[PDB]
Design a protein around this nucleic acid. Structure first.
Lengths: 314, 313, 314, 313
DNA sequence: TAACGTGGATGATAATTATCATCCACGTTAG
DNA sequence: CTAACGTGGATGATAATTATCATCCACGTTA
């Protein structure tokens, strides 16, 4: 039973509304020729550019940290919000206008720092004259080979953990591991789970933050990393720096002392929309420590640690 | 221009999916097969044993092989489709007669001699449930079958490789010497098929053409469905074609022309291309005049599946 | 069918509340007024002088009168609205420019010459509300203002009573003979406005339409916001309309086309109906061609606020 | 000051609408009546003859008058309601018992002596609504009915004006001298009702308190619904209250306590306020002990609808 | 040949559900 | 006795859940 979840995930991931003309063929061919479902993959993954604009990559393997983007330059897409711009080589060529990027703020957006991006060029030249299938299949094949070599590089280092739908959103799996890391790409369905990972007995949790039971200097935090009515929060494209401020200056002057004398460490889980079904979920961004407090720029938290230890229920 | 191959492939695999599991299975079959010397068509309209119009998810014309996925009644993207059981090799998915009447102009072929494979996404034959891995097996088996089929054709030297550029060119058809049903021949316009038989025509607007090299044969470009001027039908086996007109007076006046006229007709039916919705003409055969009545119309039987071509005179 | 009036009234007073005290004040004004010969609109989108998009709680088109409720800094979270100060004849409630670009297709009018009355719901801001009696006094004097306005219009014979059935029918405007801004004229589709000038059209899919009885004038159905093909804008006073296109080539080829004629254009703007949200077309005026140039594109200035109609041509 | 009046009025008219035309009718009635010396409640929970929980769109407690909007059952924002026919003095709209079990703690009153006016918004429903004018006519006749009722009450000097500040103050009821069912008396906490009878208390945590000036009387603060500790019910007429326990043993032991204990009880029932969801206590009257048994628990009958209060000792 | 109208599908958001934290009166165990 | 903590009802806050509605998108139609 429950082997249908893999099928549903795969179908829905390959069944998204197409942003590009040649995307579907390349993505599907890569997935099918790979034929390894122990490797989790995401289509149309939102990423954060150095330019602070929101971009997207057509294929994403979180475990291997590998992106695959098809390049059809300029003019062939029909009536979409996407735009064609040049950026760093490790960043995608397709972005979204800042106007439409502010509406998608709640969506899941990650950092591409350290990630490698491969491009598949479908056009011989301008005007969208297609290129013969042979070379495209060559590109796809060498990309796949690179992926496999990466996976091998991970499994020999024993850093590779197999993909399971059922256990990946389960807190107990992370209690058993028991470390929670960025390399594992950890995201949980709700706040109660994240709280229960650290030893809480909580049945449901509606509160914005909770003090770490086994560490007096640490605070479990569930921030919105974008701007909403209550707070103005930002995060650097590298994910190293997080700024927290408030829309009202009364709350701002009131929170300063609480931040300065309060717990100096915070474990950050950011609230994000799921790429499928649009449900609120929480992604682990790291372990941050308090750096400085200004009124203008707000509070500045720097990222000290990329891994956090979990605990059994108390 | 080898780009036409790729454009064709991506557009064929880029159709709006009627079924939920269609895309995955079809694409996996195509990619794992990895033979593009085999022409394939997706969402091919076929005519069942009855008069209803059905469709198959994948079609190989060269091998005469169809592949259909069975997801059951639900998971329907198009609500007007229907789920029914039929003759031994026939698709399980059909279209309502109301919406099939809008599909008259579409290209519709005969599945009689063709073999059909089913992919069972839920329970296969023998009653055993399946998900993921098992499905792949089915696919794999299908692939093997396909491969064997090709081999079975290629050892008998009946197999002819697919080349995009030359298949719509009349010159190659005057060069090889024969136009047959096995090659699955369709041309872009009337002037081309006319040029196959030796005409010099720059453009041809006419419904029919006298054969230059044969006085007893007539080249016909009928609509095999019902339109304003004529009511035409063709049997699911493709052996019998019936023609009559909306006005019975025109039928009565055309009776004598039918009996005293040329007794054989080379038939190219006007059909919509599966892509781009442009009028194209598919070769249905060489037909002989059988009979004519007032009540049920004129009646044509198919004597030959092959016709001889000629160089321009 | 007098039920359309009922449906309209119920749906107008049944909108989702932007503010806490909106419903009470608006409904009390409407009920105590008890005059249905006066058309009224709730949550009417208006265009501020500073180019921000604003909205008014109650709107009488015939009298050109707006009524706004003030509870500051609160505005029923979570609302996209914001509280800022502006012109005396302009509302205190606005929308963030981020949400203003998504609302482009909405019906937005000019408040120039319009009078706005304010209802202050609080005695001590913030927190504690005020007493009913005083608020009712404000509402009463506002209602009296409405009545004396109506009287000053009817004694000048400029007032035309409100009828649901006849207002969307072209024949009534053919009988009246003139389409004016003071009448607040909006039609349900293009075929109707086309038929007002003498066309027999059953359906019209084209943006522009040639005036049958005048060769120098053009019936125009532009989108006054930015869409896929071209970019058009309109000044808050409605005096100036700028027309450009997304591609500069077509602008350059349309430049001479703009220069030779037709030098006059009667404008019906495409707007979303405040109820049921199906495309409708509002008459913005009679504009004349001023300038041809790149960037801001062609510039049209409004020469006339009224246009004469004609019987069907045959 | 009078801002509490404003807050109350706004919150009463700001409830999430159960019906489509509710808001318009209610608001027009309130505004056109324009008398705020009359307390009014919207979406008031009532107990039907048949023990189902119903609701009325507008309720005037002082006049004991209900106003219900009659819509076709087809338009409901809350699909949780149900459309049924009942007694003439009873509303047409009810709630399903499944969620009515969650509504136990809510404030529920008796409609027996109350009169209900209906506003019919649809001429031949389904489909088109009736014209505005007629609806306004119904609203008007209802309003003048209300005014005439108020006049009938002020002429008999049974009417007491509505004041927010003094209605929750025990001292005011000590000054009036009587706590009556007609006055619709509800207090914020047990300490207040205890202070009405002469107790001096900062807070009172106990379920019941002995009447200082009467040894045969007991001030009771029961839950009139079924809870963990006790199972209690009250008749729709409010005349009969049954008291039982989840455990039968405790009931058997409570038999002797009931027969040998104080034979009279002044009942203040614990209810959730219609606004702000705070525990409140409504005066149910003076009940006397009739009988006690294992199966039926104990049975209390209501002897008096009014009780005399006293100054602190 | 292209633009508009219509119904199922998708995402947004109001209305509801359920749990925790804070406050406060009362009671315990520690000197 | 006071000082430091536990216990349970009353009260308020808000995410998670469901429930309901509006917007998006593909297809058939028509100028």
């Amino acid at each position: 039973k429950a082997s249908s979840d893999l099928t549903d995930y795969v179908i829905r991931q390959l069944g998204r509304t197409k942003n590009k003309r040649y995307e579907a063929y390349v993505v599907s061919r890569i997935i099918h020729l790979l034929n390894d479902f122990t490797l989790k993959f995401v289509t149309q993954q939102f990423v954060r550019l150095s330019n602070k604009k929101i971009a997207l990559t057509d294929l994403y393997f979180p475990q291997l940290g590998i992106h695959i983007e098809v390049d059809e330059g300029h003019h062939f897409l029909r009536n979409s919000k996407m735009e064609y711009s040049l950026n760093q080589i490790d960043e995608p060529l397709y972005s979204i206008s800042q106007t439409e990027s502010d509406a998608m703020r709640e969506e899941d957006i990650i950092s591409i720092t350290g990630h490698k991006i491969f491009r598949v060029n479908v056009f011989k030249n301008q005007e969208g004259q297609p290129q013969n299938l042979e070379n495209i299949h060559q590109q796809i094949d060498k990309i796949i080979e690179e992926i496999k070599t990466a996976k091998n590089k991970l499994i020999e280092a024993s850093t590779f953990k197999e993909w399971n739908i059922e256990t990946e959103y389960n807190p107990q799996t992370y209690i058993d591991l028991g470390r929670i890391s960025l390399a594992d790409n950890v995201v949980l369905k709700t706040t109660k789970d994240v709280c229960n990972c650290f030893g809480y007995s909580y049945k449901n949790y509606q509160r914005g933050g909770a003090l770490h039971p086994y560490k007096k200097d640490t605070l479990i935090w569930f921030p919105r990393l974008y701007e909403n009515k209550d707070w103005i929060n930002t995060i650097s494209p590298d994910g190293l720096t997080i700024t927290e401020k408030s829309t009202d200056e009364t709350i701002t002057l009131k929170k300063l002392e609480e931040w300065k004398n309060g717990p100096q460490k915070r474990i950050v889980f950011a609230r994000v929309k799921d790429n499928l079904s649009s449900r609120a979920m929480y992604r682990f961004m790291g372990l941050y420590e308090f750096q400085k407090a200004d009124l203008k720029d707000g509070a500045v938290w720097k990222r000290v640690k990329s891994e956090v230890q979990t605990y059994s229920p108390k």
